[PDB]
Design a binder for this molecule. Structure first.
Ligand SMILES: Nc1ncnc2c1ncn2[C@@H]1O[C@H](COP(=O)(O)OP(=O)(O)O)[C@@H](O)[C@H]1O
Ligand SMILES: Nc1ncnc2c1ncn2[C@@H]1O[C@H](COP(=O)(O)OP(=O)(O)O)[C@@H](O)[C@H]1O
Ligand SMILES: Nc1ncnc2c1ncn2[C@@H]1O[C@H](COP(=O)(O)OP(=O)(O)O)[C@@H](O)[C@H]1O
Ligand SMILES: [Mg+2]
Lengths: 106, 52, 72, 52, 75, 44, 52, 525, 151
């Protein structure tokens, strides 16, 4: 978008300042209009986590089973105690079997 | 009626499939140049001649 | 593979399956004079068939999702 | 068709039958035109040039 | 499948390539426009020197390979 | 080891692209060598 | 029953094309069908390729 | 000891020799390879082949003809060369039977290989094959039927023979139309054997069924600038004169004068000579003038001023065909108009075929010359149609020359092999086995015919053998469904000359190849 | 569409496949070559063969044993490898019969080639050969004579 203005000789510092101002305004707007639930309800929080996982998963080859994987992911994250360490969630890949055969071990 | 004649060559089938594949490839090549919304192809021969 | 005409035999078997409700009618590869696989004792595991279908569908989806190759 | 076990001779005869039927069908859709009708000639030329 | 003894470009690739060639030709002579424009000094790789501001002369003297660039030069 | 009547048939059909790509460079090299040897050897 | 229903690029959907003046002579479609069917029949009666 | 397997070396660098076992192996492999290649293009259900030339032009050819397949292949096996030359000579003698003779020779050589493996001297095989060939030839000659006396029956035989010849080619799609076309074209020759009197013109575009035999004649030449483009009740004069910067044939002559006025006078004299020649030509009272050579500007201007159409550059074939179709006499002198016959036709005009324009002669006087317009979708289709039509015309001309006919569909081979077997079970020694192998090859011919259709070849051949054993001498392969039937009723007729030539050529080539026990090749150039 | 005869290239460089007719031709040629090599050394009037090693020692070996002949040859035809392994296993099981089993296998494969050329499905040939083998084994067993009782 800023390439045509560069080609016509606009000083780069003006573009940098405009980018900084626009980004600051956009971040402030995002923080302002973001929807949050100030209730700490267990069921509502779990539903929010499941929906976020489904949205983050509905772009890959496992999108057909996105609900199943999202539920297991939410369960696995909730079983983590306080630091949510990634090394505490083992991932084992075994050849053969359908995607629905994948299981989460408590 | 039974087992029937056994085709022990399989070369004619391969030739037919190759011919069909070549024809289908040619059609898919000249498929986008069809109708009022079809575009043109620019072809440069062995020499420097250019034909749109 | 057994020498019979594919389309005619498959169409006849499918028509027989539709007409009389019997999902055991198959391709008489050994020419035993009957199509009922229950009588011929042609038995395969349900788990095997389910795994076949599931794996084939998964691999087909994964191949269809690919739209770019970057070989060196 | 060939992968279904059909000999590549029944295919040719059936295609000939389909071609004859299609020629008859197209002749059914035809409309007589006279060279004295300039509008039809102009429309045909415009349709020919639409894709270029 | 085509088995055509040559290279083939299709879609956005060829369009972008043509626009590239046209933009390169334009940028060659963009600096010789208007009273604050400046001349160019062409050398014919045998020692012959040509100094000019005319766009037609510059485009005629340059060696052009891409068909779209040739189209612009002929234009 | 028999069947000397190979009748290679459509074998070379699938390799015309590579064969002709090599043959173009081979012909260019042969032409260059002929032009180089047009003067030399003839009365060298 | 719409005999003349065709693709309308200008409208963007399906409509009568005789109102769009998109017409062609019968001896274009007829010739194309006949020659294409003949070529397909000729190709189908081939089972080997020989290099001279 | 042999030349190669000796402590001393006796050969040039690159030369070699192959002794009995190796030479027989190479010859049998080459012959069997040729037979297997040419087969599968045999019988009504035979397929075509693609001949992709590797040269600079890279000519593409699609054909069912065995001779054209065999001639356009790079062959290094000498026995394969023998078989190729056999096929070429077969094509030269008669139009049809190249694939049949090649396959028969290959089967005979395969049986010979089996017999040699059975420890039988090749001379015994050759003697047995000579006896079998004699018996089969006598049986086929006795089986021949002649219908030249009856006109309607002879025409029916011609129709059947043309249909049988065209049944295996690409023209089988429109077999009736092309059969009638070829029969009419041959009958228009009025007994003349010159197939060059029939011209096949291939014009791209249109269906194969659009091909037709013109009622008159067609020429692919042009007309002068100021000459009429349409003449009714034309009186045609065909000529083979120069009429182009016509020089007196005294090669040592020259013009030597002292002024340019004399040069102008000599030039005017030359123009007057050409004008007088044109006047002498016009004295014949003609409307259309056809010259084999070119016609220059001045003679064509003179012709146009006289309202006479002048067609130039019609080659030797062109002038011969016009003379045949119109009855005119090719003349090179014009001092005795009363001694020259002029061709006559009802109408001459220009016709529009495809995107090209041709001269059309209609209502011709004699008509003993034909033009056939072939329309097709591809160049390969046109070429194959021309080749198939040539085969049909050649066979029809042979049948006109010799009206004896035999029954096709394997009936002739079946009766030949029945006679051969009857001779074989009457002779002691291994010559009986050689004759049995001859009969096996004769059986293998219709066996391959049936195999090409996917039918139960073994069962059909066994049924045919049995039927010929009881006495049914007309049974053959009914290819409509896959049964056996009477070929007298079905009208699967074929020329006796073609079958006799196939048998004799195949036997001769098998005999000459079998006699070889040493192949010696010189150093290649 | 054949794997090798396809516009896209699947195999690595130097890898290839032979389809039905080509594979059958190769197998039959190899088997017949092995059978013809081993034969002519069969029966009382058989003749020995000289085996010249191409190694540094160039060991010389003249022999009549079929297994010995088949072991010391450079074999690239896979069907020939099958027949060679058959002969070796036959030698391991019993002392004699290597030449006989090799020749019998070669003759059977020649007949199979003829039957295939006669448009017969190889499964039918295999079933017929199984029935024939059963009948032949039963007949051979029915003719065996035992003399172990009498010294
Ligand atoms: N204005 C139009 N609206 C709808 N279809 C059209 C129009 N103009 C042309 N066509 C169709 O496009 C088709 C392709 O024509 P064209 O692209 O010129 O190639 P060709 O004439 O070789 O088929 C024609 O069959 C015609 O029916
Ligand atoms: N309609 C038919 N029915 C049965 N046999 C036929 C028929 N047409 C041709 N044949 C057989 O096919 C054989 C080969 O003929 P063809 O392939 O046309 O030419 P060529 O003799 O050159 O191979 C002939 O010997 C003939 O007996
Ligand atoms: N004296 C003999 N008379 C007839 N046949 C014999 C005689 N000796 C051996 N044979 C035959 O020769 C065949 C081959 O035996 P041999 O070559 O010794 O071992 P192998 O069975 O491994 O080839 C046997 O099947 C046997 O029938
Ligand atoms: Mg023929």
């Amino acid at each position: 978008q800023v390439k045509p203005y560069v080609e016509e000789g606009l000083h780069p510092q003006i573009i940098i300042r405009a980018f900084r101002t626009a980004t600051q305004l956009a971040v402030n707007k995002i923080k302002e209009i973001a929807v949050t639930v100030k209730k700490a309800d267990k069921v509502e929080q779990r539903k929010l986590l499941e929906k976020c996982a489904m949205t983050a998963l509905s772009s890959k080859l496992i999108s057909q089973q996105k609900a199943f994987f999202a539920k297991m992911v939410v369960d696995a994250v909730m079983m983590l105690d306080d630091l949510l360490q990634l090394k505490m969630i083992g991932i084992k890949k075994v050849q053969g079997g359908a995607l629905e055969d994948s299981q989460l071990v408590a | 009626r039974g087992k029937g004649a056994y085709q022990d060559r399989d070369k004619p089938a391969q030739i037919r499939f190759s011919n069909i594949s070549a024809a289908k490839a040619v059609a898919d090549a000249i498929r986008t140049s069809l109708g009022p919304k079809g575009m043109d192809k620019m072809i440069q021969d062995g020499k420097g001649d250019v034909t749109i | 593979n057994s020498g019979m005409n594919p389309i005619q035999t498959m169409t006849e078997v499918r028509a027989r399956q539709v007409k009389e409700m019997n999902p055991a009618l198959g391709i008489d590869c050994l020419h035993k004079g009957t199509n009922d696989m229950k009588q011929q004792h042609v038995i395969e595991t349900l788990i095997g068939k389910k795994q076949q279908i599931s794996l084939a569908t998964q691999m087909v989806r994964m191949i269809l999702k690919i739209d770019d190759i970057r070989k060196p | 068709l060939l992968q279904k076990g059909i000999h590549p001779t029944i295919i040719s005869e059936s295609f000939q039958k389909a071609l004859e039927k299609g020629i008859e069908i197209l002749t059914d859709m035809s409309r007589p035109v006279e060279l004295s009708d300039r509008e039809t000639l102009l429309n045909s030329a415009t349709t020919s040039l639409n894709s270029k | 499948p085509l088995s055509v003894f040559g290279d083939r470009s299709t879609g956005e690739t060829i369009r972008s390539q043509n626009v590239m060639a046209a933009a390169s030709i334009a940028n060659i002579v963009k600096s010789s426009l208007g009273p604050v424009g400046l001349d160019k000094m062409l050398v014919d790789d045998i020692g012959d020197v040509t100094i000019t501001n005319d766009g037609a002369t510059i485009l005629k003297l340059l060696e052009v390979e891409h068909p779209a660039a040739k189209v612009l030069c002929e234009l | 080891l028999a069947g000397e009547g190979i009748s290679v048939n459509t074998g070379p059909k699938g390799v015309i692209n590579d064969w002709r790509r090599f043959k173009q460079l081979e012909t260019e090299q042969r032409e260059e060598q002929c032009r180089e040897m047009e003067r030399l050897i003839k009365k060298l | 029953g719409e005999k003349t229903a065709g693709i309308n690029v200008r409208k963007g959907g399906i409509s009568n094309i005789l109102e769009e003046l998109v017409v062609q002579p019968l001896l274009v479609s007829v010739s194309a069908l006949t020659l294409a069917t003949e070529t397909v029949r000729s190709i189908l009666k081939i089972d080997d390729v020989v290099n001279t | 000891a042999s030349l190669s397997l000796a402590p001393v070396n006796i050969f040039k660098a690159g030369a070699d020799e192959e002794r009995a076992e190796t030479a027989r192996l190479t010859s049998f492999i080459g012959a069997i390879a040729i037979g297997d290649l040419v087969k599968s293009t045999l019988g009504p259900k035979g397929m075509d082949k693609i001949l992709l030339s590797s040269g600079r032009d890279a000519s593409l050819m699609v054909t069912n003809d065995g001779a054209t397949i065999l001639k356009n292949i790079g062959v290094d096996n000498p026995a394969a060369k023998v078989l190729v030359d056999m096929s070429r000579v077969q094509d030269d003698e008669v139009g049809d039977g190249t694939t049949s003779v090649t396959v028969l020779a290959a089967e005979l050589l395969r049986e010979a290989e089996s017999l040699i493996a059975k420890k039988i001297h090749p001379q015994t095989i050759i003697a047995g094959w000579r006896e079998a060939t004699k018996a089969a030839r006598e049986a086929l000659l006795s089986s021949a039927v002649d219908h030249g006396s009856d006109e309607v029956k002879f025409r029916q035989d011609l129709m059947n023979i043309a249909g049988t010849t065209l049944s295996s080619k690409l023209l089988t799609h429109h077999k009736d139309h092309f059969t009638k076309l070829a029969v009419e074209a041959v009958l228009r020759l009025k007994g003349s054997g010159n197939l060059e009197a029939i011209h096949i013109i291939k014009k791209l575009g249109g269906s194969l069924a659009d091909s037709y035999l013109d009622e008159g004649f067609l020429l692919d030449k042009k007309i002068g600038v100021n000459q009429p483009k349409r003449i009714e009740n034309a009186k045609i004069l065909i000529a083979n004169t120069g009429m182009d910067t016509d020089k007196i044939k005294i090669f040592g002559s020259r013009v030597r004068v002292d002024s340019t006025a004399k040069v102008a006078e000599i030039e005017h004299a030359e123009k007057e000579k050409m004008k007088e020649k044109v006047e002498r030509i016009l004295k014949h009272g003609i409307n259309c003038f056809i010259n084999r050579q070119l016609i220059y500007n001045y003679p064509e201007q003179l012709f146009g001023a006289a309202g006479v159409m002048a067609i130039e550059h019609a080659d030797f074939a062109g002038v011969e065909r016009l003379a045949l179709v119109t009855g005119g006499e090719i003349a090179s002198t014009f001092d005795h108009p009363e001694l020259v016959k002029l061709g006559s036709c009802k109408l001459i005009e220009e016709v529009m075929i495809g995107e090209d324009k041709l001269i059309h002669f209609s209502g011709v006087a004699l008509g003993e010359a034909c033009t056939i317009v072939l329309r097709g979708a591809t160049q390969q289709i046109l070429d194959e149609a021309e080749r198939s039509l040539h085969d049909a015309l050649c066979v029809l001309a042979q049948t006109v020359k010799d009206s004896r006919t035999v029954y096709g569909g394997g009936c002739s081979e079946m009766l030949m092999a029945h006679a051969v077997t009857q001779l074989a079970n009457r002779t002691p020694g291994k010559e009986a086995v050689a004759m049995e192998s001859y009969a096996k090859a004769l059986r293998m011919l219709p066996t391959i015919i049936a195999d090409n259709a996917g039918y139960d070849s073994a069962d059909l051949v066994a049924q045919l053998r049995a039927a010929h054993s009881e006495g049914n001498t007309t049974a053959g392969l009914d290819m409509r469904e896959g049964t056996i039937g009477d070929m007298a009723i079905l009208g699967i007729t074929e020329s006796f000359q073609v079958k006799r030539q196939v048998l004799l050529s195949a036997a001769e080539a098998a005999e000459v190849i079998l006699r070889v026990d040493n192949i010696i090749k010189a150093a290649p150039r």
